[PDB]
Design a protein around this ligand. Structure first.
Ligand SMILES: Nc1ncnc2c1ncn2[C@@H]1O[C@H](COP(=O)(O)OS(=O)(=O)O)[C@@H](OP(=O)(O)O)[C@H]1O
Length: 291
């Protein structure tokens, strides 16, 4: 009888989250981090899976077979994602041996304080807002834990208002940016990874204090490319129950480009978005590319 899908979001400290995360908030808030945890932190649809696969590849020295030991969401648990009878990110992590790779979409002010207290290395990934909202729309459609997104037009308005899962993109990226010097945060951009993935992976290795052979670097580059990941059942979310993710609605590995916003936004929608965007972002030193 209990339908866990398509419910309205429930606010935690003003941030709309899945009802089942809000229900289990004490478990998330009290999460016990470890000094050698690496946290992958992103606003939804910003490159989480890409960087997760990259990290697991680095940790397994480019061994593609070892990285097929399980689905990406088992290999790199989504910490706060808890759905009764289905999943519990905190429980999965509690029982995982170090070194753990941890996924989160929490804004800075909701991150379990144990990560700060343990001085964990954090890789944050940001992506231009317009591309994020396009990707998030199709994700809302296929990932049934989310509320119904409605029309593109309706969804875009909700996104601008921050009335979407994990709250406003604007606050999310800005506050993580502002935090970047306080803690061990590597702040990456999806568009940079698109333009020069080798450069970006090299930044990741230096941040992790890992040296690998050139051949292994090239292996990691290949296996983390969109075309390979899209065809990889261990990375493409096709192992999810259809009831949770319906890829016939929209595949998780959708396009993997920068600039798809130009295909989704009408000119009127774009003009309204940019006027709003400038107001919200003009006081931040953060700079994005959108193509
Ligand atoms: N390897 C690789 N290269 C390039 N792009 C990639 C890759 N893997 C995933 N993607 C694209 O990233 C979008 C998914 O974002 P996330 O992984 O952050 O989604 S989630 O928040 O974890 O659910 C989603 O973007 P869109 O294609 O624009 O929808 C994915 O297609």
């Amino acid at each position: 009888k209990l339908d866990v899908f398509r419910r309205e979001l429930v606010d935690v400290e003003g941030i709309p989250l899945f009802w089942s995360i809000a229900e289990h908030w004490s478990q998330v808030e009290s999460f016990e981090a470890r000094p050698d945890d690496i946290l992958i932190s992103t606003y939804p649809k910003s490159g989480t899976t890409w960087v997760s696969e990259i990290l697991d590849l680095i940790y397994n020295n480019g061994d593609a077979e070892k990285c097929k030991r399980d689905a990406i969401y088992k290999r790199v648990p989504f910490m706060e994602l808890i759905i009764p009878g289905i999943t519990n990110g905190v429980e999965m992590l509690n029982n995982m041996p170090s070194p753990r790779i941890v996924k989160t979409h929490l804004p800075v002010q909701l991150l379990p304080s144990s990560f700060w207290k343990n001085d964990c290395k954090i890789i944050y990934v940001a992506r231009n807002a317009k591309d994020v909202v396009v990707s998030y729309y199709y994700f809302y459609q296929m990932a049934k834990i989310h509320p119904e997104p409605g029309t593109w037009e309706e969804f875009l308005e909700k996104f601008m208002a921050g009335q979407v899962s994990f709250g406003p993109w604007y606050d999310h990226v800005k506050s993580w940016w502002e935090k970047r010097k306080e803690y061990r945060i590597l702040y990456l951009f999806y568009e940079d990874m698109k333009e020069n993935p080798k450069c970006e992976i090299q930044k990741i290795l230096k941040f992790l204090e890992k040296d690998i052979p050139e051949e292994i670097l090239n292996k990691i580059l290949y296996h983390s490319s969109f075309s390979v990941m899209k065809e990889n059942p261990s990375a493409n979310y096709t192992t999810m129950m259809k009831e949770e993710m319906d890829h016939s609605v929209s595949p998780f590995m959708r396009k993997g480009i920068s600039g798809d916003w130009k295909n989704q936004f009408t000119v009127a929608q774009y003009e309204k978005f940019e006027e709003d965007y400038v107001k919200k972002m003009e006081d931040s030193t953060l700079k994005f590319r959108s193509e």
